[PDB]
Amino acid sequence: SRTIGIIGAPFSKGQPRGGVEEGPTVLRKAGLLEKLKEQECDVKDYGDLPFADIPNDSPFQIVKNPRSVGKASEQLAGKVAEVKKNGRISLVLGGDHSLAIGSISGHARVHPDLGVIWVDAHTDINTPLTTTSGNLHGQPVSFLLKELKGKIPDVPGFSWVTPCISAKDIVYIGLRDVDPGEHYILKTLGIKYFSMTEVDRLGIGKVMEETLSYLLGRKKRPIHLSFDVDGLDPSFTPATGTPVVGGLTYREGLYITEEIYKTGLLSGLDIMEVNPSLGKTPEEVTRTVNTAVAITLACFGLAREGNHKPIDYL
Amino acid sequence: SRTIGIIGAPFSKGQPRGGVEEGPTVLRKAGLLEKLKEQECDVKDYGDLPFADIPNDSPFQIVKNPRSVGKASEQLAGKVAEVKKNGRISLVLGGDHSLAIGSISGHARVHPDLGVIWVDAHTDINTPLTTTSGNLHGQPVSFLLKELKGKIPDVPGFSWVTPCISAKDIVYIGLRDVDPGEHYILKTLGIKYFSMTEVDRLGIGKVMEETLSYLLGRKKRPIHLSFDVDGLDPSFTPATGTPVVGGLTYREGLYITEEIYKTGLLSGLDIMEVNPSLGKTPEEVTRTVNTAVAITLACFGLAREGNHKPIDYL
Amino acid sequence: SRTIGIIGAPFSKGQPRGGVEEGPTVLRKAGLLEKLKEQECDVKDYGDLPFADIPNDSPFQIVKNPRSVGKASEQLAGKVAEVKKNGRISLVLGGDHSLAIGSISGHARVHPDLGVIWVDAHTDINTPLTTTSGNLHGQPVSFLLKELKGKIPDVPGFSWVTPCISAKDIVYIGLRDVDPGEHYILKTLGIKYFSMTEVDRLGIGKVMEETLSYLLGRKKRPIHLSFDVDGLDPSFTPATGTPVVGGLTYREGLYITEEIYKTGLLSGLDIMEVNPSLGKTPEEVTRTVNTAVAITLACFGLAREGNHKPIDYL
Numbered sequence: 037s038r039t040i041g042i043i044g045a046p047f048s049k050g051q052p053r054g055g056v057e058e059g060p061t062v063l064r065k066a067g068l069l070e071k072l073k074e075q076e077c078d079v080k081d082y083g084d085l086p087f088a089d090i091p092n093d094s095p096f097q098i099v100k101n102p103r104s105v106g107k108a109s110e111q112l113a114g115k116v117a118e119v120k121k122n123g124r125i126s127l128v129l130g131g132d133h134s135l136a137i138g139s140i141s142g143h144a145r146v147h148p149d150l151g152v153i154w155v156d157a158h159t160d161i162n163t164p165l166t167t168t169s170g171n172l173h174g175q176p177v178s179f180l181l182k183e184l185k186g187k188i189p190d191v192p193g194f195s196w197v198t199p200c201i202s203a204k205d206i207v208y209i210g211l212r213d214v215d216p217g218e219h220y221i222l223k224t225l226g227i228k229y230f231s232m233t234e235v236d237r238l239g240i241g242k243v244m245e246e247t248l249s250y251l252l253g254r255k256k257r258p259i260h261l262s263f264d265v266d267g268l269d270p271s272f273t274p275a276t277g278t279p280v281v282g283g284l285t286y287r288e289g290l291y292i293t294e295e296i297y298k299t300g301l302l303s304g305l306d307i308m309e310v311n312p313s314l315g316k317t318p319e320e321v322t323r324t325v326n327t328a329v330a331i332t333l334a335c336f337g338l339a340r341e342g343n344h345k346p347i348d349y350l
Numbered sequence: 351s352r353t354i355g356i357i358g359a360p361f362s363k364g365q366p367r368g369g370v371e372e373g374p375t376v377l378r379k380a381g382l383l384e385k386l387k388e389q390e391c392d393v394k395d396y397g398d399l400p401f402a403d404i405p406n407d408s409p410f411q412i413v414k415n416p417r418s419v420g421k422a423s424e425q426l427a428g429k430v431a432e433v434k435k436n437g438r439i440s441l442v443l444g445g446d447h448s449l450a451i452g453s454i455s456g457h458a459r460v461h462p463d464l465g466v467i468w469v470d471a472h473t474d475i476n477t478p479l480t481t482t483s484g485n486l487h488g489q490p491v492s493f494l495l496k497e498l499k500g501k502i503p504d505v506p507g508f509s510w511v512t513p514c515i516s517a518k519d520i521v522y523i524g525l526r527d528v529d530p531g532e533h534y535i536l537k538t539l540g541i542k543y544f545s546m547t548e549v550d551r552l553g554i555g556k557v558m559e560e561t562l563s564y565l566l567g568r569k570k571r572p573i574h575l576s577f578d579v580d581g582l583d584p585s586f587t588p589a590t591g592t593p594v595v596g597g598l599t600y601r602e603g604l605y606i607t608e609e610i611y612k613t614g615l616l617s618g619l620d621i622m623e624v625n626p627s628l629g630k631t632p633e634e635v636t637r638t639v640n641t642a643v644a645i646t647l648a649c650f651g652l653a654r655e656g657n658h659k660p661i662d663y664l
Numbered sequence: 665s666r667t668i669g670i671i672g673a674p675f676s677k678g679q680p681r682g683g684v685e686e687g688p689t690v691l692r693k694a695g696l697l698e699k700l701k702e703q704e705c706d707v708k709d710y711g712d713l714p715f716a717d718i719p720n721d722s723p724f725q726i727v728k729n730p731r732s733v734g735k736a737s738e739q740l741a742g743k744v745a746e747v748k749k750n751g752r753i754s755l756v757l758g759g760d761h762s763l764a765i766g767s768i769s770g771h772a773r774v775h776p777d778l779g780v781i782w783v784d785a786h787t788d789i790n791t792p793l794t795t796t797s798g799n800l801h802g803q804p805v806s807f808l809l810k811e812l813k814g815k816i817p818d819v820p821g822f823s824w825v826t827p828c829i830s831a832k833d834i835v836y837i838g839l840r841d842v843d844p845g846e847h848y849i850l851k852t853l854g855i856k857y858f859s860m861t862e863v864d865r866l867g868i869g870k871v872m873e874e875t876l877s878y879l880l881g882r883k884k885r886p887i888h889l890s891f892d893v894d895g896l897d898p899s900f901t902p903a904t905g906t907p908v909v910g911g912l913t914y915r916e917g918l919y920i921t922e923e924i925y926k927t928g929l930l931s932g933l934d935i936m937e938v939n940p941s942l943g944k945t946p947e948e949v950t951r952t953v954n955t956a957v958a959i960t961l962a963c964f965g966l967a968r969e970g971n972h973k974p975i976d977y978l
């Protein structure tokens with residue numbers, strides 16, 4: 037089977053807007069665990085992590101709330117490593133994308149051979165020195181990459197981090213708002229990506245074929261899908277902090293996640309950047325949450341062609 | 351030429367909402383016959399069928415309004431067989447999709463070799479025993495399939511039905527809300543389908559190439575297109591009873607119907623499930639009707655690249 | 665480098681609605697020149713052309729405002745030829761599409777070997793005798809084509825025109841509302857086109873590969889892109905005079921223009937038919953202008969994957 041361990045991560049200090057803290061609540065209120073159970077799934081809820089307040093947390097140079105973000109990911113890393121030890125797929129409900137530092141680190145403690153698929157409008161690979169916003173949700177990949185060891189200063193809250201993935205172990209899908217220093221890093225390190233230009237050229241079918249052949253061609257290994265809902269067009273996921281037009285369609289989102297399910301190798305999942313307070317109407321909220329739920333159920337086997345139990349229904 | 355015989359089928363008892371009865375009226379009011387005439391076409395209006403009320407029509411087990419639905423399709427079968435005998439393409443304006451039992455049966459009385467293309471979010475292949483809703487618009491394909499003879503109980507109103515197509519003679523396009531028993535039937539009988547996952551993988555161009563090669567590869571034969579407007583995304587066809595997100599685009603709808611026109615083998619057409627009373631605004635209504643008209647004109651030769659008469663326009 | 669010369673062409677008499685005169689103003693107010701400068705670009709503003717009023721300009725047969733439209737294009741031709749002589753890419757901000765008569769003519773005075781890519785819902789190839797509207801924005805290609813010399817009467821205001829491109833030197837992309845005489849001309853002269861049916865069949869990636877191989881396969885030559893914002897779906901560009909559903913997506917627009925940038929051969933650009941007074945809300949206006957700006961920045965190197973200077977950002 038495909039057993040799941042849910043971790044709520046109601047955390048926002050990777051970016052300015054507090055409302056991403058409500059992500060785990062609204063996803064749960066939408067029926068996510070029940071819907072997973074209705075499907076094939078063995079679901080264990082590990083609850084919502086209690087992130088304690090750090091009142092003294094002044095910027096490190098440009099970088100904001102560093103101790104809060106570092107501690108939150110340190111905590112999340114421990115929890116993810118626990119559910120992996122318990123032989124379940126970690127499903128992290130965010131919260132802002134800085135949490136991927138903890139989610140991927142904890143996962144790699146148990147499965148050092150993982151490969152990452154990063155669905156996002158953004159590369160999230162600024163370093164604490166290339167960042168212009170100082171927002172740690174725009175930096176998580178730089179903390180994770182072994183090649184960028186030497187380029188990450190000693191940021192308070194992160195001394196526990198050990199880079200765990202190499203540039204050859206991640207694929208981006210959905211890119212359309214990449215900062216110049218980020219583009220430099222991508223080209224310098226030879227990281228594999230499918231920007232929206234590539235999705236337009238190739239179609240999502242060939243994008244997935246190529247993604248999965250690149251990560252799993254040599255040998256089967258665990259897959260970590262880090263899904264920023266702003267990877268999808270804001271006509272599907274408007275209640276998010278950094279929307280960018282010309283995104284992946286609803287259909288393309290489901291296709292990506294259906295194909296990853298079918299590898300049988302999904303090992304960790306992040307559903308990040310849902311911020312209900314940013315919808316301009318209550319329907320923009322429902323739209324966003326419903327889409328996030330649909331993407332999540334596809335990761336665990338819900339197929340558009342249909343599903344049945346191995347019984348004779350006639 | 352390509353002569354057409356219009357049949358209005360203002361019938362709703364295959365499902366709960368009465369407003370699909372207005373389908374033939376609003377399609378006609380939108381200028382459909384005049385627009386067909388403006389095009390290449392020889393159009394004969396056979397009028398709207400008068401469906402008489404059946405006051406005593408209690409459910410058969412789960413199954414609702416069985417005698418009303420059976421009689422309506424029996425009537426429609428006769429009428430379609432008439433216009434086929436008169437050497438015209440039957441164009442059935444619905445009405446709910448239970449009418450396809452009559453439309454395809456009547457057609458097959460004259461052209462037993464037909465092939466069916468079924469454009470829908472749904473497979474409509476529940477049997478009277480697998481159905482959970484008891485709504486006959488979700489069952490028509492099971493009454494038509496020769497393989498499912500033995501699995502259809504003797505439902506009052508349907509003793510006149512003789513299954514007329516085999517599992518190898520239908521192709522589905524657009525599927526995204528298939529019940530478990532339906533998915534079992536699809537896999538058991540080896541029915542050809544292009545769910546939205548397949549349309550995403552392949553593109554609509556390859557979907558059509560493959561559809562038409564599957565049905566017409568061995569030999570040319572008449573094609574019956576049964577078109578449920580909920581096959582298209584509800585952003586194009588919102589005024590319908592069972593909308594499902596992530597549908598075929600307007601463009602994909604026109605492409606399907608342009609390609610079928612170009613085979614020269616269109617023999618019967620169903621335009622089903624238009625329900626103006628379900629639009630939330632008068633523009634949702636116009637949107638839905640206009641899209642249904644556009645799909646219909648493409649079936650009879652309107653091409654996006656343009657059209658001209660065999661005259662010298664210079 | 666890729667130096668640009670901006671020409672504002674605030675002209676509307678090719679069609680009935682005056683508000684396309686505001687196109688150059690709103691594009692400039694949206695930050696277009698500054699955004700180009702932020703990118704790689706060497707931008708020289710040649711200002712807005714002053715089109716003088718012609719009070720005595722009665723129709724020529726069907727054809728409206730002929731002397732106004734002819735004079736405006738004569739003026740624009742001179743200006744475009746100037747900026748080409750100055751070794752810059754002419755960027756014409758319209759204004760209605762009748763201006764392409766001047767823009768392409770002026771360009772060809774300096775680069776007689778150019779090839780044209782015409783992005784539009786419409787072919788704009790009516791002659792003064794096949795037109796039914798008499799609106800010159802629907803006629804510019806017929807004045808430009810050497811093969812249609814003999815079929816263009818002597819229209820007042822156009823005696824200065826010399827047809828400068830052959831039928832083999834233009835490719836259309838986006839067609840979906842082509843008049844019968846226009847379709848006759850397309851088929852008679854064997855003009856290359858990708859209607860929306862072809863874009864649906866092939867995908868925009870293969871459309872661009874085929875466009876560019878057709879125009880540049882034999883030898884490199886300058887490219888003139890004439891971009892009517894109604895080529896894009898009205899969900900992206902609603903503030904325009906002749907919207908047509910089922911258009912190119914935002915993504916497809918950016919892909920077309922990214923691919924043309926990458927040839928290194930863009931030589932002239934037209935951004936036509938933006939009419940802010942036709943948006944039904946202030947957001948429809950911003951939507952339309954923002955999309956036109958995005959298409960324009962892609963023509964000059966803005967890439968969705970990102971951009972960086974040849975510096976070490978680490």
Ligand SMILES: N[C@@H](CCCC[B-](O)(O)O)C(=O)O
Pocket residue numbers: 132133134156157158159160162167168169170171173174175215264266278309
């Ligand atoms: N590159 C910008 C945007 C980051 C957006 C972060 B994300 O993808 O997690 O939403 C920044 O560094 O601040």
Ligand SMILES: N[C@@H](CCCC[B-](O)(O)O)C(=O)O
Pocket residue numbers: 446447448470471472473474476481482483484485487488489529578580592623
């Ligand atoms: N499978 C559901 C939905 C049927 C919808 C029917 B249709 O496709 O014609 O709109 C049911 O059996 O009730």
Ligand SMILES: N[C@@H](CCCC[B-](O)(O)O)C(=O)O
Pocket residue numbers: 760761762784785786787788790795796797798799801802803843892894906937
């Ligand atoms: N074919 C119609 C429509 C022309 C629309 C012009 B255009 O593409 O520049 O917006 C006419 O001749 O009037």
Ligand SMILES: [Mn+2]
Pocket residue numbers: 156157158264266267278
């Ligand atoms: Mn993002």
Ligand SMILES: [Mn+2]
Pocket residue numbers: 133156158160173264
């Ligand atoms: Mn992100």
Ligand SMILES: [Mn+2]
Pocket residue numbers: 470471472578580581592
């Ligand atoms: Mn349906």
Ligand SMILES: [Mn+2]
Pocket residue numbers: 447470472474487578
């Ligand atoms: Mn149906």
Ligand SMILES: [Mn+2]
Pocket residue numbers: 784785786892894895906
């Ligand atoms: Mn146009």
Ligand SMILES: [Mn+2]
Pocket residue numbers: 761784786788801892
């Ligand atoms: Mn035009």
